[PDB]
């Protein structure tokens, strides 16, 4: 039986050949073993003994019954690994950490947190005699009747959904229970019963009872419900709130304005207009979500993000699986803090500036050692947890890093030793840089051959940036020598661009450095020939991607490859100090800007804001003294902004009333940005430009349940080659009443022939991240799923594919996962 | 089979006071609950009182509060209805009855709960 396994697992007795048989033994049904061990990256070594260790496993569970099925499978889950730390209980955080001064009597009084636990106080007195440990006081604390009411996250107003919870009976005798449902005004109870009666049941001692209610939402989002419990010991009342939210896929549409009446900046605009525009999709009965934001300076947004929300909100809306985004959270403090204390601008807080700097220096400390749990034994930087080394994401955190050691010091010994892996190790002999993992940082255009070789440009550029920037920590001879053959390869084989992408990236690289050679101007001279001006005189510049895309084509919709390469057009221009041409390309940046001050995608975020920031502190910012006023087109007005130095942090205002909206200013001098988001909820995808192949379906099996299966592929346009994608971000909404199975994605996740690179389950979603999407066939998630409880008239759920990088690229269909006819309130108006 | 039986009872004047017994026999003693109830003739039946034997807790019948006291013993499985200041309302022939499960308070005993009836007392007041 499993003797057969065993062999070759303890006989091969290698630390990492182990884990490949182990995990070459899991069941896996849908595909073939040499399919399991065509994914696997670690070499051959292994894959002798996973392929043999799958046959094996294979074979061997051909004429066993359900009994030696799990009996294999739990005598393999031990001895092939070591262990991994894991707990199972969360204890809430403690209290009563005060330090106090006893004259030989004191008394505190305080309340205890609501948890039924045992808590345990102890107390350590110290003096000039010396210390002492006071006897340890246990108090409990214990409700001998309890109700707990399991709610679902989020629901659908359409729906009948039940919601089951538990009495719960602590008594050692029998007793009988009532159980009331308050029923608010916009949920039909379906019975209306309003005191709404009562059903009494019994318990027995020391039991529980499960208890059920059916309900219907009518408005949208209401948190207001009450459940009494009333047994012979009296009525206990349990609150408790319910998310509601329409049906379609919710969308957001941005825009941006910058107002500025003195024209300095190269424009006069005093009044902006944004149209209350209603899309053909609309769903009914959903009232358009618009929330607009005036801020007091191109940086202005940033300040609100960082400063005026005590927690660091997100920029973006991407999955947090991924090192880039935990790095990520740094990014818009440290660029906060370059202005602030660069600028030298502490006066603008009223409170002591010195706490508030401290305060931002620990929040940078924060985010420097959160992003510590990526590095690996040899100070190099993984892009996954366990994952292999990645230059790209290297030399990116070792950018960041070199950027957070100019305010707070950073181990030079770390820096010192990714500085010269990411050199010694992974290098060309011309200069080059090639890549350790296969974490694919964006696709690029042209057919192979070009993809290579662009491929390689972009990654020794970004190589070079990150260096030049961390170079101060640890100047060495051999790491010049590096850099200099380095940029020697950008300056021969440069100039040929095959896309403005890499020709603008290289320019940038090229700007930081030597700034003499003639070749590097011809190479400034090409990038400025590719610009794109809207106005005459120019008011908009821009670049793109312009390969065969020359013919004058704006679609007015902002890219990360098109605002990726604006900013890196924008920052070659600052660091060779030409003001006169940045203007527009300054004012372009500030409009495209969005609510929290985050761009599309990462990549495209920070080089955006480091050119906003960079060109706030180099031409010399202009006092705030400035009259914004907003009003409706043909309802009232709102409300009026006078923005100071000392005010313009003013808190968001969201848009209530329906009308055409227009924000008008007075004789001022600075800048103003005024940006509004639009939150539309629409019921289909017709419209959109799908990208992706797509298709899910709910399959049953053979304790029998449902399972799930989506297949995704990559449709690549006429210029790209049949490669595939790049980092790609597969997310599912689950149908309401329904679960994601963990142990599937745990096994799907956590294997040599891992299908996928992270998987996770946030507010009812499943998001998935994988490191290619392929183009010719299609690539298939499949896991079971469990029903919660019984829901009826279910709406259905989404499935979208996106490219992490650039999330223009998007596919999203509308799925669901049975859908067959069920009187009580049915109908909703 | 469980039993309760019922003694005590007879004749009293206006304001006078008697003791009640309810011998309970055939159930686990410390998991039940024991009423008191009234059925005067021609009218419907009423409960009066109730004792929780578990913790000891009470329950008097709003219009009979403090006028009445209910206390078990634990060591001979009967209860002792204490009906002291016998004003001549009650006029009744009372019933104790047992039941396993607690009730709800509130609307109080009435709507006849309990699974466990005895033969009941007659008590008797002239005014």
């Known amino acids: 039986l499993q003797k057969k396994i065993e062999e070759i697992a303890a006989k091969y007795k290698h630390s990492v050949v182990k884990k490949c048989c182990y995990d070459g033994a899991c069941v896996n049904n849908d595909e073939t073993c040499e399919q399991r061990a065509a994914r696997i990256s670690l070499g051959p070594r292994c894959i002798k003994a996973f392929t043999e260790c799958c046959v094996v496993a294979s074979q061997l569970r051909a004429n066993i019954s359900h009994k030696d099925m799990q009996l294999g499978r739990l005598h393999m889950k031990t001895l092939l690994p070591v262990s991994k730390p894991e707990i199972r209980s969360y204890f809430p955080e403690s209290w009563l950490w005060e330090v106090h001064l006893v004259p030989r009597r004191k008394q505190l009084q305080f309340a205890l947190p609501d948890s039924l636990t045992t808590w345990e106080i102890q107390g350590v007195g110290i003096s000039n005699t010396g210390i002492c440990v006071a006897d340890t006081v246990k108090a409990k604390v214990f409700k001998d009747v309890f109700l707990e009411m399991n709610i679902p996250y989020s629901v659908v107003r359409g729906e009948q959904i039940q919601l089951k919870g538990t009495v719960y009976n602590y008594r050692t005798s029998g007793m009988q229970f009532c159980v009331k449902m308050s029923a608010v005004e916009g949920i039909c109870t379906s019975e209306s019963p309003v005191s709404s009666k009562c059903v009494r049941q019994k318990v027995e001692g020391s039991s529980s009872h499960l208890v059920t209610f059916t309900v219907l939402p009518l408005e949208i989002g209401l948190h207001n419900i009450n459940f009494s419990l009333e047994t012979w010991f009296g009525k206990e009342i349990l609150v408790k709130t319910l998310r509601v939210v329409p049906e379609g896929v919710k969308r957001e549409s941005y825009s941006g304005v910058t107002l500025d009446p003195r024209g300095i900046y190269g424009t006069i605009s005093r009044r902006k207009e944004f149209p209350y525009r209603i899309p053909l999709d609309l769903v009914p009965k959903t009232e358009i979500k618009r929330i607009l934001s005036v801020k007091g300076l191109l940086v202005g947004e940033i300040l609100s993000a960082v400063l005026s929300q005590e927690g660091i909100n997100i920029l973006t809306h991407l999955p947090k699986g991924s090192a880039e985004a935990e790095l990520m959270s740094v990014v818009p403090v440290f660029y906060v803090f370059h202005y602030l204390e660069t600028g030298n601008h502490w006066n603008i807080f009223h409170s002591d500036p010195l706490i508030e700097k401290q305060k931002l220096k620990k929040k940078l400390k924060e985010g420097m050692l959160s992003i510590m749990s990526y590095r690996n034994a040899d100070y190099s930087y993984s892009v996954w947890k366990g994952g292999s080394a990645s230059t790209w994401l290297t030399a990116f955190a070792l950018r960041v890093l070199g950027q957070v050691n100019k305010y707070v010091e950073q181990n030079q010994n770390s820096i010192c030793n990714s500085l010269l892996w990411l050199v010694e190790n992974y290098q060309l002999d011309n200069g080059s840089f090639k890549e350790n993992s296969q974490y694919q940082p964006i696709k690029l255009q042209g057919t192979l051959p070009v993809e290579a070789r662009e491929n390689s440009l972009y990654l020794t550029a970004f190589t070079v940036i990150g260096i030049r920037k961390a170079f101060d920590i640890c100047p060495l001879v051999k790491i010049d020598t590096a850099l200099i053959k380095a940029d020697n390869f950008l300056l021969e084989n440069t100039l040929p661009a095959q896309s403005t992408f890499t020709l603008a990236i290289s320019a940038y690289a090229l700007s930081l450095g030597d700034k003499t050679h003639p070749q590097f101007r011809s190479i400034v001279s090409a990038l400025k020939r590719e610009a794109l001006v809207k106005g005459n005189p120019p008011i908009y510049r821009f670049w793109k991607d312009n390969l065969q895309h020359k013919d004058s084509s704006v679609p007015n919709t902002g890219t990360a490859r098109m605002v990726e390469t604006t900013a890196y057009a924008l920052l070659t221009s600052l660091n060779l100090k030409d003001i006169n041409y940045v203007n527009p390309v300054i004012k372009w940046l500030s409009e495209e800007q969005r609510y929290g001050g985050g761009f599309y995608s990462t990549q495209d975020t920070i080089n955006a804001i480091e050119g906003l920031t960079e060109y706030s502190l180099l031409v010399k910012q202009l006092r705030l003294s400035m009259d914004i006023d907003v009003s409706y087109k043909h309802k009232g007005a709102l409300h009026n902004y006078k923005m100071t130095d000392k005010n313009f942090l003013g808190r968001p205002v969201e848009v209530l009333l329906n009308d055409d909206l227009i924000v008008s200013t007075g004789f001022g001098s600075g800048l103003a940005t005024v940006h509004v988001t639009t939150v539309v909820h629409k019921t289909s995808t017709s419209e959109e430009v799908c990208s992706f192949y797509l298709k899910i379906d709910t399959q049953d099996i053979e304790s029998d349940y449902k399972r799930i299966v989506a297949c995704a592929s990559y449709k690549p346009s006429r210029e790209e080659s049949s490669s595939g994608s790049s980092h790609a971000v597969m997310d599912i909404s689950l149908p309401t009443g329904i679960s994601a199975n963990e142990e599937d994605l745990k096994a799907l996740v956590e294997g040599v022939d891992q299908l996928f690179t992270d998987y996770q389950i946030k507010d009812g979603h499943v998001i998935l991240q994988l490191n290619s999407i392929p183009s010719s066939d299609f690539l298939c998630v499949r896991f079971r799923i469990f029903e919660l409880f019984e829901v009826g008239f279910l709406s259905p759920a989404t499935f979208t594919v996106y490219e992490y990088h650039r999330p223009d690229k998007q596919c999203t269909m509308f799925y669901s996962t049975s859908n067959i006819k069920i009187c009580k309130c049915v109908e909703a108006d | 089979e469980v039993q309760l039986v019922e003694s005590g009872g007879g004749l009293v004047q206006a304001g006078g006071s008697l003791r009640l017994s309810c011998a309970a026999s055939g159930f686990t003693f410390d998991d039940y609950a024991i009423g008191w109830f009234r059925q005067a003739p021609g009218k419907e039946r009423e409960g009066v009182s109730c004792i929780s034997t578990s913790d000891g807790s009470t329950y008097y019948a709003d219009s009979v509060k403090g006028r009445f006291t209910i206390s078990s013993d634990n060591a001979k499985n009967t209860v002792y209805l204490q009906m002291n200041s016998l004003k001549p309302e009650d006029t009744a022939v009372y019933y104790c009855?047992?039941?396993?499960?607690?009730?709800?308070?509130?609307?109080?005993?009435?709507?006849?709960?309990?699974?466990?009836w005895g033969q009941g007392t007659q008590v008797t007041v002239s005014s």
């Open positions: 009855a047992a039941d396993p499960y607690l009730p709800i308070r509130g609307r109080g005993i009435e709507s006849t709960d309990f699974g466990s």
